[PDB]
Amino acid sequence: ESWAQSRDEQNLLQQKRIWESPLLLAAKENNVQALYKLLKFEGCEVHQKGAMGETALHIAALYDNNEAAQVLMEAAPELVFEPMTSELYEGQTALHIAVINQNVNLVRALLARGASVSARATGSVFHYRPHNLIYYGEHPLSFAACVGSEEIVRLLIEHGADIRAQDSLGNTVLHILILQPNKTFACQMYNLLLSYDGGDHLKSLELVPNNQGLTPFKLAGVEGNIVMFQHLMQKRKHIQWTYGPLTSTLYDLTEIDSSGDDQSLLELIVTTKKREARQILDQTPVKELVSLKWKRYGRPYFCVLGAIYVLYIICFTMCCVYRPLKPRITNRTNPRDNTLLQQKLLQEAYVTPKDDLRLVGELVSIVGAVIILLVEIPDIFRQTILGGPFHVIIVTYAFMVLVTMVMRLTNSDGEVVPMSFALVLGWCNVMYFARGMIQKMIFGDLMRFCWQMAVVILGFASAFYIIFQTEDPDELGHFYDYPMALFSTFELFLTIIDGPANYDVDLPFMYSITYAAFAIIATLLMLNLLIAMMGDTHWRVAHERDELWRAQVVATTVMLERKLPRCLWPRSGICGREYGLGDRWFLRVEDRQD
């Protein structure tokens, strides 16, 4: 039923065969005299494959038995080429085991016998899986780079190790170094592998991308390797001049911004689930980038698009507060008086006196809903909430408006259930537009509550109004007109009014549902306020409160750059073509030092 049990069963099974096979046992214990008393007379199987398809040399290489390994090579030099014939270690040679163990003399001897420096260890243990503690790759050169042994690295290059070699996952020796825990020390090894590159501008090793379309520089950002990212940044920044403390450095800004449909560091950071990758935006070439993208273009277009959405939702409620109308007509208010409806449905509701003002208003609510779907539906085909569930709500709001239209033209009785959902989904999606020390942050987070509060009540008071605009105000008239309805709901937002409560009669199916959602949102905002009031002052967790919002702003800034056309929102940085720099866009960033 599992897999980890198998390899745990095999390692125990391996030590069994070593304990049984006297050749393998002598290769483990480095019993030199027992190898001569076994290989010359009475010759035993020397190509003896153990439990993991290992030769006697593989066991002599696992335990760094140089004396025992040299006897196994002089009596049978063909053991050097032999790889592990198992499934867990398919491809691993005696050289791979000697490289990771940093056995320079055994590596020197294995290379002297002519070991393959291009052997791919494609075994299941060497995979990049969470159940494998190390990921070094496949080639023995890739092993030497990860163990930090610069001596074996160059010693393998001298015997024809291809640095351009990629594993099953399309990772070069450079990609794998970035996926190593020792970040500060891998920078030293990374520069060693680069020195053996072809030296030509074309076919560079740092440009060879991952199988998932990630150059090593780009992979460092997505993986959140801060030390590798800053190191690789040194090779793509030019210091313009030195003016005392000022150091105007010109950054590359090539693989850090968008033209790639999906290839761009910014998009890969805001859409990845990796918590460590969020720190990459904050680096000295990137933090200047998104800060310029939000000060200009970003913030104004977000509030311009906001004011357009505030007007589009207040118009939808303008057509709801004055919904269509005939009183009950039916005597159904006499039997089963528990239902006191004065239901209102309307078809030749063409009769126009002030009804065309709402009709053109209802037409705005329709043409705006399809436009919402014309910018979100073609976008789902090409989904990570960093930046708020605004997209999940904006598509379900337009769905309720279309259902209300489908509700219309058929004269259905349940015209309230799909229309009321659009009121809360339309308003509470406005509070997402709130993206525009402990003192001002308490006040800063308090203004988010004051914005999120007034938005919630304006969506539930308009809802509760429709829920009891048809019903009778004789009993339970908490929302008999709009001005009240807002005031009742506002007090209901603080639990001052006892909640529309009535059990003699019955009240529509939507009140027992809409009021249930209103009671939960009211406490979560008041719980999120307390955390915004205490979490802001407790400790520097206000920073943790802080870059989550900053990352939400960066995630929103990248969102506004995808759908907006090229005529608006010009490209960041400065193009290089005349003034001479080759048509990449560079960012001029200067810093003072103290």
In the bound state with its own copies, the residue whose beta carbon lies nearer, of 11 and 118, is: 11
Q: Which of residues 522-581 bind ligand DTB (CB under 6 A)?
A: none
Rounded Cα–Cα distance for residues 562 and 271 (Å): 14
Structural contact between residues 493 and 522, judged by C-beta atoms closer than 8 angstroms = yes
Rounded Cα–Cα distance for residues 415 and 435 (Å): 34
In the bound state with its own copies, the residue whose beta carbon lies nearer, of 180 and 365, is: 180
Q: Which of residues 84-103 bind ligand DTB (CB under 6 A)?
A: 89
Q: What share of the chain is helix, strand, coil (3-state, %, to 5)?
A: 55, 5, 40
In the bound state with its own copies, the residue whose beta carbon lies nearer, of 92 and 343, is: 92
Quote the least distance from Cβ 370 to ligand DTB, whole Å.
51
Quote the least distance from Cβ 241 to its own copies, whole Å.
5
In the bound state with its own copies, the residue whose beta carbon lies nearer, of 59 and 407, is: 59
Quote the least distance from Cβ 193 to its own copies, whole Å.
19
Q: Kindly report the length of the chain.
A: 594
In the bound state with its own copies, the residue whose beta carbon lies nearer, of 399 and 490, is: 490
Rounded Cα–Cα distance for residues 280 and 495 (Å): 44
Quote the least distance from Cβ 408 to its own copies, whole Å.
29
Among 118, 132, 204, 284, binds ligand DTB (CB under 6 A): 132
Quote the least distance from Cβ 519 to its own copies, whole Å.
6
In the bound state with its own copies, the residue whose beta carbon lies nearer, of 308 and 534, is: 534
In the bound state with ligand DTB, the residue whose beta carbon lies nearer, of 58 and 120, is: 58
In the bound state with ligand DTB, the residue whose beta carbon lies nearer, of 250 and 277, is: 250
Among 18, 125, 266, 400, binds ligand DTB (CB under 6 A): 125
Structure tokens at 300: 């104004």
Quote the least distance from Cβ 230 to ligand DTB, whole Å.
24
Place of tokens 């005597």: 331
Choose the contact partner of 547 out of ligand DTB, its own copies, none; CB within 5 to 8 A by kind: none
Structure tokens at 251: 């950054």
Choose the contact partner of 505 out of its own copies, ligand DTB, none; CB within 5 to 8 A by kind: none
Sheet of strand 246-251, all strands in order from the earlier edge strand to the far edge: 237-243, 246-251, 585-589, 574-575
Residues β-bridged to residue 238: 250
Under the criterion CB under 6 A, does residue 136 sit at the interface with ligand DTB? no
Choose the contact partner of 548 out of its own copies, ligand DTB, none; CB within 5 to 8 A by kind: its own copies
Q: Which residues contact 123 (CB under 8 A, 6 or more apart)?
A: 84, 86, 87, 88, 89, 90, 91, 92
Choose the contact partner of 5 out of ligand DTB, its own copies, none; CB within 5 to 8 A by kind: its own copies
The radius of gyration of the chain's CA atoms, rounded to the nearest angstrom, is 35
Q: Point out the residue whose Cβ comes nearest to ligand DTB.
A: 125
Structure tokens at 414: 């349940």
In the bound state with ligand DTB, the residue whose beta carbon lies nearer, of 19 and 509, is: 19
Among 1, 43, 133, 474, binds ligand DTB (CB under 6 A): 133
Structural contact between residues 574 and 562, judged by C-beta atoms closer than 8 angstroms = no
Closest CA to 193 of 240, 241, 228: 228
In the bound state with its own copies, the residue whose beta carbon lies nearer, of 326 and 538, is: 538
Cα distances (angstroms) measured from residue 94 to each of 70, 157, 331? 12, 18, 94
Quote the least distance from Cβ 28 to ligand DTB, whole Å.
10
Rounded Cα–Cα distance for residues 8 and 13 (Å): 9
Under the criterion CB under 6 A, does residue 126 sit at the interface with ligand DTB? yes
SS3 (DSSP) at 16? helix
Which range touches ligand DTB (CB under 6 A), out of 24-32, 126-134, 150-158, 427-435?
126-134
Q: Does 594 appear as a known binding residue?
A: no
Phi, psi torsion values for 200, nearest 5 degrees: -90, 150
Instruction: For CA atoms 228, 291, 551, 211, give the dihedral sign.
Output: negative
In the bound state with ligand DTB, the residue whose beta carbon lies nearer, of 132 and 347, is: 132
Quote the least distance from Cβ 176 to ligand DTB, whole Å.
14
Give the other-Cβ count within 10 Å of 66's Cβ.
16
Quote the least distance from Cβ 43 to ligand DTB, whole Å.
23
Structural contact between residues 143 and 100, judged by C-beta atoms closer than 8 angstroms = yes
Rounded Cα–Cα distance for residues 165 and 163 (Å): 5
Which range touches ligand DTB (CB under 6 A), out of 128-136, 186-194, 452-460, 545-553?
128-136
Rounded Cα–Cα distance for residues 79 and 93 (Å): 9
Choose the contact partner of 151 out of ligand DTB, its own copies, none; CB within 5 to 8 A by kind: none
Which range touches ligand DTB (CB under 6 A), out of 132-140, 395-403, 413-421, 553-561?
132-140
Structural contact between residues 167 and 210, judged by C-beta atoms closer than 8 angstroms = no
Q: Which of residues 236-265 bind ligand DTB (CB under 6 A)?
A: 241, 243, 246
Structural contact between residues 48 and 21, judged by C-beta atoms closer than 8 angstroms = yes
Q: Which of residues 42-81 bind ligand DTB (CB under 6 A)?
A: 52, 54, 58, 62
In the bound state with its own copies, the residue whose beta carbon lies nearer, of 367 and 437, is: 437
Structure tokens at 67: 């004396």
Choose the contact partner of 126 out of its own copies, ligand DTB, none; CB within 5 to 8 A by kind: ligand DTB
Quote the least distance from Cβ 212 to ligand DTB, whole Å.
21
Q: Which of residues 471-510 bind ligand DTB (CB under 6 A)?
A: none
Choose the contact partner of 58 out of ligand DTB, its own copies, none; CB within 5 to 8 A by kind: ligand DTB
Quote the least distance from Cβ 157 to ligand DTB, whole Å.
24
Structural contact between residues 559 and 545, judged by C-beta atoms closer than 8 angstroms = no
Which range touches ligand DTB (CB under 6 A), out of 131-139, 410-418, 460-468, 491-499?
131-139
Rounded Cα–Cα distance for residues 32 and 370 (Å): 82
Cα distances (angstroms) measured from residue 19 to each of 22, 25, 63, 247, 407? 7, 6, 14, 66, 79
Cα distances (angstroms) measured from residue 201 to each of 152, 160, 206, 229? 27, 22, 11, 21
Give the other-Cβ count within 10 Å of 324's Cβ.
14
Closest CA to 294 of 560, 545, 546, 548: 560
Residue numbers belonging to the annotated binding site: 498
Per CB under 6 A, residues contacting ligand DTB are: 52, 54, 58, 62, 89, 125-126, 132-134, 241, 243, 246
Residue numbers belonging to the annotated binding site for Ca(2+): 498
